[PDB]
């Protein structure tokens, strides 16, 4: 949601991305802001979005599951992540091969 959040988490503590942060034309904090620790679960959601755009289905699924399993994310964000992301994109998932372990943990 919007772009300055987006920008800042994905540019990390390296000068990556040319996308200016906030409504300012500054490149200054596009070489800083590596959403980590507390912002780590939040960082991982924005990155899951980057991965769809850079056409990964494998690493994309993986990031989405990681957050679903995390017991310190709310329980009420169950039906929300699966309904919007996993449910339409049923095909892409279906193509991929899932073992006994991944299925049982989910």
């Amino acid at each position: 949601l919007d772009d300055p959040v987006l920008n800042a988490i994905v540019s990390k503590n390296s000068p990556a991305e040319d996308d200016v942060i906030i409504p300012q034309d500054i490149l200054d904090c596009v070489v800083t802001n590596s959403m980590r620790q507390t912002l780590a679960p939040y960082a991982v959601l924005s990155q899951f979005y980057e991965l769809r755009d850079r056409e990964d289905w494998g690493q994309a699924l993986r990031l989405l599951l990681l957050l679903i399993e995390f017991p310190y994310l709310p329980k009420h964000y169950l039906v929300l992540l699966v309904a919007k992301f996993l449910y339409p994109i049923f095909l892409l998932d279906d193509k991929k091969l899932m073992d006994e372990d991944s299925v049982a943990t989910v």
């Binding site: 980590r36 620790q37 507390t38 780590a40 679960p41 995390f70 310190y72």
Partner: peptide, 14 residues
Amino acid sequence: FDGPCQNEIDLLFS
């Protein structure tokens, strides 16, 4: 591991 660590200590105190 980062996120788990910090929150896991936080519950234990609480």
